[PDB]
Design an enzyme around this catalytic site. Sequence first.
Site, short mmCIF file in Angstrom:
data_model
loop_
_atom_site.label_atom_id
_atom_site.label_comp_id
_atom_site.label_asym_id
_atom_site.label_seq_id
_atom_site.Cartn_x
_atom_site.Cartn_y
_atom_site.Cartn_z
N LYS A 8 -6.02 -3.03 7.28
CA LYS A 8 -5.63 -4.16 7.86
C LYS A 8 -6.10 -5.48 7.04
N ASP A 66 6.15 -3.71 -6.50
CA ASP A 66 6.59 -3.43 -5.17
C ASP A 66 7.26 -4.68 -4.68
OD1 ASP A 66 6.79 -2.17 -2.54
OD2 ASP A 66 4.54 -2.99 -2.18
#
Length: 286
Positions: free
Chosen positions: A30, A138
């Site tokens: 998270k 990415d």
Amino acid sequence: MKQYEHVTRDLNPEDFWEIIGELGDGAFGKVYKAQNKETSVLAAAKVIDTKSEEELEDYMVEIDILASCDHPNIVKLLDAFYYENNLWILIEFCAGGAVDAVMLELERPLTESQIQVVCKQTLDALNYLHDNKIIHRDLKAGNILFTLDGDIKLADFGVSAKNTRSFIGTPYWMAPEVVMCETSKDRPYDYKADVWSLGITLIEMAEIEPPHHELNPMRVLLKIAKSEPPTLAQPSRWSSNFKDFLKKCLEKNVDARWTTSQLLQHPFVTVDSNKPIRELIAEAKA
Ligand SMILES: COc1ccccc1C1=C(Nc2nc3ccccc3s2)C(=O)NC1=O
């Protein structure tokens, strides 16, 4: 015992940064929204379970990349802590959110004028990275963030790499490129992977989803390897400049694929106003 330049040890990050919400989930767990208790500065906070000194060293690459970059379209490192077997990375917050989240919230893709701004600024960021021998690795619309002023920042360097990262011996037989440290990793080739990802990201912003989004991920890998590069699905809705810029990114022959330096000369990214993005985020606030 290793002393890291940008990582505090044995101090409780939450003595300085208050978690005030959640920003999402990902490979690294998270990610929180945090607020500095003294300055009220906002931050994205990665909190990474790291059990061993070896794991810490691996996650440190992202911190050293963020700390070394100083470019207006790349998120900056605000703080970092190693505490109770967690690596905390406090990163510059962009309140406009990620580009893919915006398209999903509005249930429509970006317009070409909006894509042009995102493309120019993302290219500026990528060019800076490549000039400094960093590969993002990415790039996707999920890793591009809107600021409230209508700019973007490139984010999530979690898998980015410093691509070039004791005796010498008798030197008489060494090649010039060995002496000069011009290895294959110093050459344009590897950095061009990011250029391809830019092209996919442009189609993603044009169509909400990237090419092959309907396929199983293993089948996607086969398609990428075997198929001709993707094009826009409705090519007549888009300018020749946009389609041409994509062709220079979505080029399977790596030597022919353009560098960021070449793309910065392309007419699609001759643009000096972020007003399309200011309009995008101004109406969204209404
Ligand atoms: C794309 O941005 C990041 C990706 C990973 C880690 C941090 C960030 C990030 C922000 N935004 C968000 N994080 C997250 C995290 C997970 C899912 C959605 C979201 S959207 C932000 O404002 N400053 C930052 O570095």
